[PDB]
Amino acid sequence: VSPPPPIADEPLTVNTGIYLIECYSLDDKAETFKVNAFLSLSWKDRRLAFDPVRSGVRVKTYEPEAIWIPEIRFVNVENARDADVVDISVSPDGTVQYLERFSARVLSPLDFRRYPFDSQTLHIYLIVRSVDTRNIVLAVDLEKVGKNDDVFLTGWDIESFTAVVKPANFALEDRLESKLDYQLRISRCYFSYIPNIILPMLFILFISWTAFWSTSYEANVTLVVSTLIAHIAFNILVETNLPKTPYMTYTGAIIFMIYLFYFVAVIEVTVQHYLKVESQPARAASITRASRIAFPVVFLLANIILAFLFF
Amino acid sequence: VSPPPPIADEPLTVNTGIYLIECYSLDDKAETFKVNAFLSLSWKDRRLAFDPVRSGVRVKTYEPEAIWIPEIRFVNVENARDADVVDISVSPDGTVQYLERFSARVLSPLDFRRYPFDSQTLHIYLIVRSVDTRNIVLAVDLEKVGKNDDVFLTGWDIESFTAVVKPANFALEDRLESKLDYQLRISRCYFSYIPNIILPMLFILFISWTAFWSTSYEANVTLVVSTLIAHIAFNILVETNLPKTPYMTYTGAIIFMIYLFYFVAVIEVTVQHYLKVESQPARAASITRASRIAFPVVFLLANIILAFLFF
Amino acid sequence: VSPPPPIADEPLTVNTGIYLIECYSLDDKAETFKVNAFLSLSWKDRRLAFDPVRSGVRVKTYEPEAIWIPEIRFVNVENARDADVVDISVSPDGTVQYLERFSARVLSPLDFRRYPFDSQTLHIYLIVRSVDTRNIVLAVDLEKVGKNDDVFLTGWDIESFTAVVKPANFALEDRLESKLDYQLRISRCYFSYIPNIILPMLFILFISWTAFWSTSYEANVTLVVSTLIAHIAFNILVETNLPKTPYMTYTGAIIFMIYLFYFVAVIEVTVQHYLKVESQPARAASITRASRIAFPVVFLLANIILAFLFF
Amino acid sequence: VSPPPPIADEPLTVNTGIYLIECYSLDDKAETFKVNAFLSLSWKDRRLAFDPVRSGVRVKTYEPEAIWIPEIRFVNVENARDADVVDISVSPDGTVQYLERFSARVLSPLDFRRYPFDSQTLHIYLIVRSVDTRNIVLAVDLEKVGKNDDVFLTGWDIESFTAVVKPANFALEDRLESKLDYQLRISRCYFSYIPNIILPMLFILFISWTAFWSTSYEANVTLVVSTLIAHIAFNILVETNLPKTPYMTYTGAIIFMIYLFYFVAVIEVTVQHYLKVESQPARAASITRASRIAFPVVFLLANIILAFLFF
Amino acid sequence: VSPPPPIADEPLTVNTGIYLIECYSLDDKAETFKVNAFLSLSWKDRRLAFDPVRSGVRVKTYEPEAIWIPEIRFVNVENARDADVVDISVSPDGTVQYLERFSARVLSPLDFRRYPFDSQTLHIYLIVRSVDTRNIVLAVDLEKVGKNDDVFLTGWDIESFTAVVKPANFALEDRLESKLDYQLRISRCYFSYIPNIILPMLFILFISWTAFWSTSYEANVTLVVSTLIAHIAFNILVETNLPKTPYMTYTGAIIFMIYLFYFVAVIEVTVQHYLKVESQPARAASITRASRIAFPVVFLLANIILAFLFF
């Protein structure tokens, strides 16, 4: 079987359509997600045309081996998909209606800079490579693009599944390739963020600041250094929840500024003590009492600096 | 091979039956479980009917390629199943008795809000897609739905394996699909919660409260801050046992309220000290002595608030 | 090829035999072990009988496709085995001697209640499903059941590999199945428990008890609370060695009772201090001095309670 | 099919070309990376030559089985690649144009001595083994060597993909092999190095040095030993980011020297105390005051020693 | 195709040869290593003999399916190898020269008692099972046994790859098997052990001993108990580097004895305090001053006891 010969000089249009049955295994670290879907392809091969009256039937069904079928592939997949052909139907004019169910692991890049208020745009790129006998381009049948309502990705909200209708047609290793962009949009979700990461990290930070209602260098050193251990040990506890990136994220910045407020708290505590033992308990107490409004306010305003920086 | 032609206008009934041989690899995080089972299918194709007298035999056995067999598929599977056909038997009337042994990884959503007293309902969804020549619906042979007695899922109690007999018949990409719901019910199980998570976490919390039988700001700061480290380090130790969810669970709420009781204990300790060094040891001692009934009672009642909130 | 017709009304005996070549990958968590072995099957198909004189040969060798061979399967495997047929030999009477080398991942349940003095019984269950034309039962050729001497499972002692000769014959989805139990016994092994888990955990516990040779509430609070952190951090260190079960184990009980001895030590320390600051240093000292024989003795006797409870 | 016979005594040239479609799964620990690419091969087999006029066609397409095709293999792969032949085209002169899409896991050694300013050179080694009837050598078509612009490796910058045009021709197990070196260059990237590993580790180190503005052996011991715990716990937190190597890295040296500055700080603190309690508070204070310029300066200069050692 | 008939009653010699191309993925825990190599086999099948003059060619090449080829297998592999036949060459006399490239995961037992100065002997065991028609033995072609110079195993030194030429011929399940031992000798390598495990663990241990230049029970308790936490937290940090074995290793013994020196340090500190508060500061100071030479010397000598015990 050859590809269908062209009527004029025109290339062959294949009408694509992905319907998401399941989506699962978004690996935030590997920048992958697994998907289980229908792929529908449709084109016109007039070599397969027939008379519905003389053949007796409205629709002819073939096996994949029997007829010509285009080699459609995914670009951004790890390995080629687990495909199973569901149905091949040819109408009287020669219009082939192909359908397969596939499952593929997909590499779409992720951006965690606004964690845990980030949203993502997952791509599924479909290509077809043209042949020597005829050129092939993809098109999108927008009625055959959708998703099951049961489609769930725990800890995200699946907003929308579409495709960009204009395919990207381009030359590669001396032949025309036609690429299509199918986009799954999603938006994050971590109702427990505040009680699982933020609130206990604010509490351990506030505990360090009770050293501004105290003058014991021995109690203060225990307060500030022991709660710094408590902070690091807590960061250890929530390490699994936080994104491990080579760049700075929003939650990551909050964390960093907290390590800074531990450093500045120690400076104060050391200064307050150096002034009191250096017989200036006037200036010593003036600083420690100022820190009690200075630290919380500077914290709140810097957090507004960050918030506004990222959003 | 086409599907069997209909006698009247009726659709084709396939009689389904899943018998669980093994169940294993419930991944609480990925919301999957692996299963190894028999799938039995049964329908009537009168094109395969024969005379037992003239054929000489009572039952004819075919190969899968030889005869028409419906394309049954699972909905909520990662990849299509590892199927091995066990037996195909056709009786004189044309009744096909199909049997295969499969193993599949399955995506059923899990709800840990009532951890570790949660129960689950694992779904295995069977579909069949109807064809142009004839409509197909699934039915359930409830005598062929069951499970091996050896079937174990460590840390759960396998309660029941059934199917919802009314199939869900619906149109999808222009054809009728017939869906079936097979439900594995399970219920959790963790005797170690009481002896592995709750009791040592109550002990480390109680240790923090011995600061209400003390007036040393230096001993008290060590008591409350060191036991807060002990709490976080313990939470680290039992991190593997606890469910890593984007939502708030019951055990997770207990944990959170404990981080709050550390914060409130520090407030008290700081206030008691601020009053004693501010020459009001009457009010200082009044508070610290009140906390000794206040803290434990508030704890017990809040835990009853939580308990009743979740149950 | 059909199954061999019966001489009388008798069912077909297949003579089984597993010889373990390697065993490896015991996953204590997943309750699996991998195995690499020979499976030998032997039955009589008199349709394959021949005259050694007229055929010219002593033994005829066939290909698997050529002759009838029973569908033997494992029950408690994740996926069906990686089988490679080694030899098929038919003697003049029609006795088929089949041999294959397989490797399979196996689900046998494990019991860690007596960790690290537990022993296990790993099952490999062989089934055969009878057919419409004839009934099939398994038998054990005990000369063809054994294990290579190199067979090693690091951290255990491979005691014995046998089979229970009486097969379990039973009806399943309307046909007779014949099941066989092959048992690999194993017994645990951990000299490092004493020098890796128990001894450093007794040392950190004893360190907490030097607070009975002291009256400083500040040193005592540091001793008991700091060593409790040391205990939890050590439990973290040996978390990989200890079994993560939903039930209580023997080592797990020892651990739990140690968390209790930290709680009781804190009670004492708090009471001793409350009596001394409440001007009763007679009773204060009486208790602290009694704890010095009370604690170690109660520990030793409770450990004998536990020991005897589990053994 | 034999290899094409030589015109003269010359060997057969195959023109190679790898175009990277995706690259992913760089395992820093295992020294692997996965890749998905096109491999293009081109040679002249004049046995396949044809007359475009009499054959009627400009280009003949064959199946892999039909014609002779060289066994090209990768050297440094774990398992042989997942190859799928995309197109085989023969022009009138007998020039075969082969194209396949493969995905392979690759073992290229990595050097982390200059972490996190290291750059890498990933190799993909192509071999062909010559045969008895004729010698085979690889050549590089540099226009067919390239990479997709979407090719991403999170936390690195993909600089360049080329091949060394001079193939390495050599005798192995009595035959000529022709090897080619395809090099993917990459350079590291951890913009957050300073902000997540270095800065909080300098802060916890500086906190230890506030013991030079103090004379309390009890506060100083808490300062230096508690911040040493904070250092180790932080190193635990950033363990995932740091490379696990059997050799010394640059970041690893910084870490090591920090453990040394904790040791030397303790020596000082112990000496300062030993002199003050040994009634020499002149020399005691002289040392502690000197450490306040000595420690930071020695640190800065040693870090310049290291920096210059590695770069 | 049957095996070649014997000329006399002699058995068939197959000449083996493994050439290591790559070696990788030594899993210290699972006692496996992956390997990628050439396997060369050579034997005489006179059924394949030909006249070079009449056939026209000097050497005939066959496909694996075409001719008889022995079932050579590995003993100590997890799954049977990923084999790809590279070349089959038959000379005029019937001498088959087979070559395949395989990759296999291999189970060779490892001994870490002298970690990190241990050396290993990795086995690759080749078997052939004799058949009913003829006996088969393996031989070693020592010119076809070697390794690529690029062969690397990070953190080890690949010393040598040979085979024991005398095959082990033996009866198994009623037939002769011929076994061969191919040995890869490797030796460990960890310069970072001294700068990653031993030195910071000696520093944290030395810090505990500054309590012999001090008489404050409160500072001493903080010194010894806080550095014991620091020791456990550090052991946590280097847990990944250290071998997780059921037996006692050399590095493991060093670790254990360090936990003992923490226990003995606490005993001293408790005794020194009990004597000073029990008004015997003569004996109290005598002990503490003796410990300053006793502890370091006993440490050094015990480490020489260990060193000499293991080596």
In quaternary terms, these chains amount to homopentamer
Number of domains of chain A: 2
Q: Quickly count the helices of chain A.
A: 5
Spatial separation of the terminal alpha carbons of chain A:
57 Å
Tell me the β content of chain A: 25-35%
Judging by the overall fold, what is the CATH architecture of the largest domain in chain A? Distorted Sandwich
- Rg result of chain A: 31 Å
Please tally the β strands of chain A and state the result: 11
* Biggest sheet descriptor of chain A: 7 strands, mixed
Structural class of chain A: alpha+beta
CATH homologous superfamily designation of the largest domain in chain A: Neurotransmitter-gated ion-channel ligand-binding domain
Order of helices and strands of chain A: EEHEEEEEEEEEHHHH
**What overall form of chain A do the CA principal axes indicate?**
rod-shaped
User: Share of helix among residues of chain A?
Assistant: 25-40%
Greatest chain-chain contact? A-B, 57 and 52 residues
Could you walk me through the main structural features you see in this protein, from its secondary elements to its overall organization?
The structure is a homopentamer of 311-residue chains. Helices cover 32% and strands 33% of the residues of chain A. With 311 residues, the first copy, chain A, is α+β, with helices and mostly antiparallel strands. Chain A folds into two domains: 1-192, Distorted Sandwich (Acetylcholine Binding Protein, Chain: A), CATH 2.70.170; 193-311, Methane Monooxygenase Hydroxylase, Chain G, domain 1. Chain A is rod-shaped and about 110 Å long. At the A-D interface, α3 and α4 of A face β1, β2, β4, β5 and α2 of D. Chains A, B, C, D, E: It is found in: Cell inner membrane.
